[PDB]
Amino acid sequence: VQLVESGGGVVHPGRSLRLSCAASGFTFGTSIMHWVRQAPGKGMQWVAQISHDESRKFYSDSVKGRFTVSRDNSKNTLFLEMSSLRIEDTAVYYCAKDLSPPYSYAWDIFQYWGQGSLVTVSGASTKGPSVFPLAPSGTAALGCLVKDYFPEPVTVSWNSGALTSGVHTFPAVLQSSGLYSLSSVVTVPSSSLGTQTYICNVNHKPSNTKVDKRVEPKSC
Amino acid sequence: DIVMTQSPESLAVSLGERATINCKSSQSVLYSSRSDNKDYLAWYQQKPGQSPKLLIYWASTRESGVPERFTGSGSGTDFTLSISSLQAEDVAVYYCQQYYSSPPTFGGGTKVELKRTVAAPSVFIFPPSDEQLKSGTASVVCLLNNFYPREAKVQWKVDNALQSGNSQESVTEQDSKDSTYSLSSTLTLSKADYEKHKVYACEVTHQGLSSPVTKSFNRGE
Numbered sequence: 001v002q003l004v005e006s007g008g009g010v011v012h013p014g015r016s017l018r019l020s021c022a023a024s025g026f027t028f029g030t031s032i033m034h035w036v037r038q039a040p041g042k043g044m045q046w047v048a049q050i051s052h053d054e055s056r057k058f059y060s061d062s063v064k065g066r067f068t069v070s071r072d073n074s075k076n077t078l079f080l081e082m083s084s085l086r087i088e089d090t091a092v093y094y095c096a097k098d099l100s101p102p103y104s105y106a107w108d109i110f111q112y113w114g115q116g117s118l119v120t121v122s123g124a125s126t127k128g129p130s131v132f133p134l135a136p137s138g139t140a141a142l143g144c145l146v147k148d149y150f151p152e153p154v155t156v157s158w159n160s161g162a163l164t165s166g167v168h169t170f171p172a173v174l175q176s177s178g179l180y181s182l183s184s185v186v187t188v189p190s191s192s193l194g195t196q197t198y199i200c201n202v203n204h205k206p207s208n209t210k211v212d213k214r215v216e217p218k219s220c
Numbered sequence: 221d222i223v224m225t226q227s228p229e230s231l232a233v234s235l236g237e238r239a240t241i242n243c244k245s246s247q248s249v250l251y252s253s254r255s256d257n258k259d260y261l262a263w264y265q266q267k268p269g270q271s272p273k274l275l276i277y278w279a280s281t282r283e284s285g286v287p288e289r290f291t292g293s294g295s296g297t298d299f300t301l302s303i304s305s306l307q308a309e310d311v312a313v314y315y316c317q318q319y320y321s322s323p324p325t326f327g328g329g330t331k332v333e334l335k336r337t338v339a340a341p342s343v344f345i346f347p348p349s350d351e352q353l354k355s356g357t358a359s360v361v362c363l364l365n366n367f368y369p370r371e372a373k374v375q376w377k378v379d380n381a382l383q384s385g386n387s388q389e390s391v392t393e394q395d396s397k398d399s400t401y402s403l404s405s406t407l408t409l410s411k412a413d414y415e416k417h418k419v420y421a422c423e424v425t426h427q428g429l430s431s432p433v434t435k436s437f438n439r440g441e
Contacts, residue, residue: 044326108319168402170390
């Protein structure tokens with residue numbers, strides 16, 4: 001059972017955006033599906049419900065008239081067409097399967113969820129990050145500073161994903177500038193610094209930025 | 221129109237101990253029919269960045285694969301999620317949800333934290349990189365690594381002068397394996413100002429430190 005939401009990003013207020021949800025592992029064609037969202041630092045809010053054949057659709061009064069839920073059973077995909085978006089629509093949107101059996105009305109029991117897709121609604125300019133090294137000078141700490149980007153998020157890996165132990169990517173902090181800042185660190189044996197190469201791979205999809213900064217040690 | 225209210229907002233309990241999460245619905249979610257009475261309430265678990273998981277429903281019935289240490293109880297208007305013996309992997313936010321009336325509504329969530337042994341932070345300091353100083357700005361970073369509890373004081377000093385308002389903190393979520401925290405503290409400065417002062421220091425205070433720990437450097441060496 002897998003629910004993978006795609007689409008989503010930053011949109012200016014008033015514009016539209018379509019989310020998709022690819023399903024596998026269950027009879028998607030005969031099951032009721034939902035959309036549920038989670039705003040920053042708040043609880044879940046149900047958004048929409050749709051039946052197996054689309055004949056029955058239901059929406060939260062918060063999105064009624066602006067959002068449209070649809071589905072393509074031939075491709076096992078659920079859709080959410082979002083229009084006339086507002087700042088308060090910023091949230092991570094989850095795709096969820098209802099526990100109700102085939103051809104029965106919804107139970108409103110969210111049996112399965114996806115990992116979610118972040119939707120940002122702001123009239124603020126998109127901007128990529130600048131990546132600077134946090135250079136190390138029996139355990140040594142390396143890092144990368146990802147500064148002055150918007151909107152969120154950025155993802156950081158180390159050595160193309162090969163290095164994952166001791167990695168700590170901190171949550172973004174919004175500066176007085178209105179741009180986000182983020183740090184990613186990793187602890188590594190001090191004796192490998194002279195031989196092992198350490199490269200932080202930063203990815204900011206809204207800006208189509210993808211940086212690979214090599215962190216060199218300081219020796220004295 | 222049903223409002224769900226969870227209490228407490230967060231709790232910390234030791235390994236093997238019991239965690240209790242309470243949930244209250246603004247209206248009764250007990251439905252009467254030709255068959256047995258059922259309480260239309262469900263419980264979900266959410267780890268940061270991961271797909272939410274259904275735990276319990278009908279108030280007390282466990283979802284397939286849910287360990288028995290998760291127990292749902294209550295009726296009508298008051299409900300409780302009980303974790304018999306908390307495990308590190310249990311660290312998560314837990315939400316309740318009613319499906320008695322439309323629209324289905326969720327509680328605000330309860331953060332469940334694992335109360336483990338005190339662990340002092342490993343402190344490191346990072347000067348601004350030559351790359352950034354060439355770009356016209358300067359960021360001094362201080363790292364507190366793998367410590368517990370979360371509470372910790374970071375105070376920046378520039379030429380022995382204490383700083384305030386010019387720094388920002390960020391804390392990781394509790395680790396999945398050792399149940400520790402990591403903290404970053406960034407002192408933002410202008411290049412011109414950075415070049416006028418010499419010694420930059422990050423002083424850390426924590427329950428696991430007998431005395432304040434200091435990590436510092438001299439700008440020009």
